[PDB]
Write a protein that binds this ligand. Structure first.
Ligand code: F9F
Ligand code: F9F
Ligand code: PLP
Ligand code: PLP
Ligand code: NA
Ligand code: NA
Lengths: 268, 393, 393, 268
């Protein structure tokens, strides 16, 4: 399908940035996670980034570590996550859906079979957090055979060789890292990335989304100003879940408030 | 691109977030340079001799083998400073850290021997050491935690996931992914992403080099087999490396069988797990059917790394090395036998290697065989574990 | 009549019941013969090298001495099999037992290291070992009691007198006075009746012989001083012996000062006791004004032999060796310093020797001096003793 | 004085053996120990062997170890023991009194001063249990300067050289060891000692008293039959003390009964 290409063309027509929330599938349970995701979309999310709970999320800080643990406390499995993905797509035909995976969950029952299941449920992209471009060949090949965009991370450290590789190999969007370290709202990135954003456009890369530490409206506007196509936010979204565990209704109200503010910051 | 092959056949690789690739490339380049540098080799040899106590003895065990055609030697890594083989490679990695201009060390530890080894190397060489340890392990390894703190290391309990070794491995990599410019990650076994399996082998290979020289001197020939326990693979690859090209020499790795392979309560991923991708490598893993990483179980917590070094998976796949398992009860009997018949208290880890050599002898007592067991550590640390089991019999 | 002089000046002798004189004469004759026997020397050298791990390292301590004109080396008896120097002489005495046709060993022990050393030597050489231990010591040394029992030794609690080391010494001699024809008494220090002070020195003197060779190789000269803790005198006479005729080399023995000499709660009989006759010798003793034998007190139970070897009393009397004391608190600070700055956990016994070298350096930091401390054992055994004191500060 | 010489001449006139009990001075207290000793003499003891409580009695088995501990529980000191010795001699002018000492108590305040105190209170002999003949010179010289007999032990193992030494050096009596090991009634000696007794008489030794494990009348008669001048018994006497601690009156009755039976076994 062409869901990212259609989204970025529509956003470009409106001189608009993308706002893309991350959540963990099944955090804090399947039913409440489906309600959370519908609330994110109704509040104006342009695309989704969705994590499958994994025992060892070594690219994630404590907020998303604790999201994975809540989903496991609710008995959430990868099979249940794919059932959720099919339902989400059945409700929402055009929104791009990206997964954040760890390699073992993709490799476990065969790389090709993983990407075939992605295609069946209507996923648009997969970011495998612990597969660097150097190891990516079988993942990107399987992704593209099943009409899935393989997403790569561009560190702020990225040398010219790596920018060329990410530009050549990635599709859908380029994940522009704000900083070194792991996911978390407590650490803000401070890279102008004007040159990285400029070099990616020169090398005809998929449009850049700036992510890691994006927690406020001004960071969304700043990302777009710097020439990024949009911004991704997770720990900030997940923190609203963690804060409001005792009140599922207030949790949805605060998620709606936050996403509506972050999306407003992307508009012309 | 890399200078060295990151794979052993299909096994190994560099499965880390992109942000960590420069740290691994920097480490590989420093290692390749260090291995060509006579000054680095001389400094490492000086520390191994004058601080750690190398060469270690090779002890013949005539009381154990009496009345059989087995000759059994023990390579005495239990006599190395710190009481286990881990000291060899932490001294080399600490020197690599200094070669790269780093002043800080990060280490993971399970039962605590790698934490203690990392802390003692850091104390000697003037490095600031922080050690991640699963909160469950912190709770049950107070002696090793106290040793690390006496040596000036920071011990950081890890509460995420299962609060055990794999979770400390994750936390060490999360820290390194922000701190690599000033901190070296001193990985504790011959596993993880390239170049660690290669580095740890080369910084342990004096075990096998000395064993070869010592057995030639005493016996005038190579061993029929060298036998080593396999938790993550470092003491075994250190014994095996110098014999790999001696095709007459058996290489036997012993994984923990725990309560028995059939119970599922074991730590034998190489022969009874499933290949996966975790901790930066493609290797056999303890994992659920769904691909969630599991714990290894053994009476010996030191054998509970829930995967295995990729070079062992490779040597197995080509038939150069053979891998077996030994249960808790077999290891316990070997522990008691060595104490009573040789006056050596072995680590329960090493007791798994000895138990398999005892089986090789007892099953075929008229088979002529010259065996070397890598006695990877001493077992003072295990006497209460053994007391608690014996007392409950 | 004897073959060798039983005295060192006025100190030493053979103050045992008449019934035990044939046992001492037999032992002296076997020892004199053994020292002329190349086969005995070769067997002892084989055990020391291939079982115990000799030679031990000589470790330079630049982190400790930085900014001073002290050069400090540690003789690493902590790396000997069993974790202390005691292993050297028990292997020699076990060989003497076999030379005399004996199949059984009797030993005394206080804090338990001599019991463990005796048990491991007996296990290796196929001897039946029984160990006397004061009931009070049995109660507070469960780890060492368990080690002795794992190695197949009988541990016999002693309830007579103060139920501590001197009472175990008595019980060992009471047993030997009936069993000498089939049992050897494997005395644990360079003390007791002749020929034990002589035998234990000669079976420890490789400490000083190796130190001399190692310091000549590294420094091109002899040490200014060699420094050793003194409980009964064995590790110190083993370091000192080969330097006695090198008149330029200081010989410094360190007794435990406990809570302070002035408190009376110490273990420094050589400088702060009174000559008496007990345990088969005339020597300085901890004793009441009325002549009842008292206990030594130290934070380190291993230094609590309540007398001292007669050769140390002699070397002091002629001014060849100097004896000093170090308090509990000084020993504790040295323990912490070595852990933090060299990554070596020393025995609290050995920490007394290190503390005095630290004082020699710190008091006169611009004095040029080349010092060797005998690091008589490792301090894994002491980490809870040290934890309990630190935690209560 | 000539107390041993006069005793053995009188016993020889009556073709009689000596019976010599051992007790620890001050066991179980000073007053009861003085009553015990008077009871031993009234019941027919020919001489006494008296121990001074010592911290480390390495020639003694458990019975006499426990006697030393009872005396220490009562605060008994060597000074109090010498006060007791003076009183015993003041009551009983002719009975030979022998001490069983350990070397440290003799050496403690000077060997000569120890033997001078012995002479002052009227002691006849000293046996220093942990001084072999090889080390005995200063002890025997000080003893003889103060009219004290130095007593030596003759083991059953004794070679010819040792018999000659003990014969030359000892006075008062020769202590003939029944066996190897330590004091105790639970272990009986089994050496004919006819040759040792014969060799000692040939070398003009002080008369032999057989001791260690002597607990019954038949052992007293057997000692005399073998040509010994008498027998010494301790653990058997001390065991009667230990058994009757709770009844001081019955303790004295049982001591009287036992000593009267053992002395009867010595008579022609
Ligand atoms: O807002 P934050 O700081 O929580 O960051 C959002 C992260 N969510 S995500 O799925 O984009 C994401 C993307 C990449 C990650 O690791 C990798 F870079 F190594 F690949 C991890 C998570
Ligand atoms: O009847 P037993 O078995 O208790 O023996 C009596 C012992 N009492 S004693 O004073 O004669 C006596 C004599 C000699 C002793 O030791 C020595 F031989 F080494 F000198 C000890 C005690
Ligand atoms: C750490 C340890 C092991 C297991 O680790 P490997 O990397 O497999 O060698 C084995 N023996 C001892 C004594 C250890 O300390
Ligand atoms: C036994 C012991 C000592 C004290 O005994 P010495 O005979 O005086 O040497 C000292 N250090 C250690 C480590 C010991 O084990
Ligand atoms: Na493993
Ligand atoms: Na002492």
């Amino acid at each position: 399908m062409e869901r990212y290409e259609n989204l970025f063309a529509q956003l470009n027509d409106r001189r608009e940035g993308a706002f893309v929330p991350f959540v963990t599938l099944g955090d804090p349970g399947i039913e409440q996670s489906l309600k959370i995701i519908d609330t994110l979309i109704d509040a104006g999310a342009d695309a989704l980034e969705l994590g499958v709970p994994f025992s060892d999320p070594l690219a994630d800080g404590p907020t998303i570590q604790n999201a994975n643990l809540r989903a496991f406390a609710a008995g959430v499995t990868p099979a249940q996550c794919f059932e959720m993905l099919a339902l989400i797509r059945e409700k929402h035909p055009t929104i791009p859906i990206g997964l954040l995976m760890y390699a073992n969950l993709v490799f476990n029952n065969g790389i090709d079979a993983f990407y075939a299941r992605c295609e069946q449920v209507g996923v648009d992209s997969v970011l495998v957090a612990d597969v660097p471009v150097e190891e990516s060949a079988p993942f990107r090949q399987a992704a593209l055979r099943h009409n899935i965009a393989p997403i790569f991370i561009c560190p702020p450290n990225a040398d010219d060789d790596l920018l060329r590789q990410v530009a050549s190999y990635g599709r859908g969007y380029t994940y522009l890292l704000s900083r070194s370290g792991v996911t978390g709202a407590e650490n803000r990135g401070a890279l102008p990335l004007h040159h990285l954003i400029e070099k990616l456009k020169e090398y005809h890369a998929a449009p850049a989304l700036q992510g890691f530490g994006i927690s406020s409206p001004e960071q969304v506007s700043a990302a777009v100003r710097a020439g990024a196509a949009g911004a991704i936010s997770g720990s900030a979204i997940v923190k609203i879940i963690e804060k409001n565990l005792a009140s599922p209704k207030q949790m949805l109200a605060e998620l709606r408030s936050f996403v509506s503010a972050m999306k407003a910051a992307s508009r012309a | 691109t890399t200078l060295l092959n990151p794979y052993f056949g299909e096994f190994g690789g560099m499965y880390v977030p992109q942000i960590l690739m420069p740290a691994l490339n920097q480490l590989e380049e420093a290692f390749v340079s260090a291995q060509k540098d006579p000054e680095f080799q001389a400094q490492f040899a000086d520390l191994l001799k004058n601080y750690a106590g190398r060469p270690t003895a090779l002890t013949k065990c005539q009381n154990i083998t009496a009345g059989t055609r087995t000759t059994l030697y023990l390579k005495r890594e239990d006599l190395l400073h710190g009481g286990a083989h881990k000291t060899n490679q932490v001294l080399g990695q600490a020197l690599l850290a200094k070669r790269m201009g780093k002043s800080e060390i990060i280490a993971e530890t399970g039962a605590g021997q790698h934490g203690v080894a990392s802390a003692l190397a850091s104390a000697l060489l003037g490095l600031k050491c922080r050690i991640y340890m699963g909160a469950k392990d912190v709770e049950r390894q107070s002696p090793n935690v106290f040793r690390m703190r006496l040596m000036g290391a920071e011990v950081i309990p890890v509460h995420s996931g299962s609060a055990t070794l794999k979770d400390a491995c994750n936390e060490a990599l999360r820290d390194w992914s922000g701190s690599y410019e000033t901190a070296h990650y001193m990985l504790g076994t011959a596993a993880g992403p390239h170049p660690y399996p290669t580095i740890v082998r080369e910084f342990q290979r004096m075990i096998g080099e000395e064993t070869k020289a010592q057995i030639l001197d005493k016996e005038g020939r190579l061993p029929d087999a060298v036998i080593a326990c396999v938790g993550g693979g470092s003491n075994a690859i250190g014994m095996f490396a110098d014999f790999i090209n001696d095709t007459s020499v058996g290489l036997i790795g012993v994984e923990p069988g725990g309560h028995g392979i059939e119970t599922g309560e074991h730590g034998a991923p190489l022969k009874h797990g499933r290949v996966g991708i975790y901790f930066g490598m493609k290797a056999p893993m303890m994992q659920t059917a769904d691909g969630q990483i599991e714990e290894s179980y053994s009476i010996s917590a030191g054998l509970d790394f829930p995967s295995v070094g990729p070079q062992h998976a490779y040597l197995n796949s080509i038939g150069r090395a053979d891998y077996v398992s030994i249960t808790d009860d077999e290891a316990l009997e070997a522990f008691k036998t060595l104490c009573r018949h040789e006056g050596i208290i072995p680590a329960l880890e090493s007791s798994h290697a000895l138990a398999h050599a005892l089986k090789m002898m007892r099953e075929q007592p008229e088979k002529e065989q010259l065996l070397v067991v890598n006695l990877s550590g001493r077992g003072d640390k295990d006497i209460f574990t053994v007391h608690d089991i014996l007392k409950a019999r």
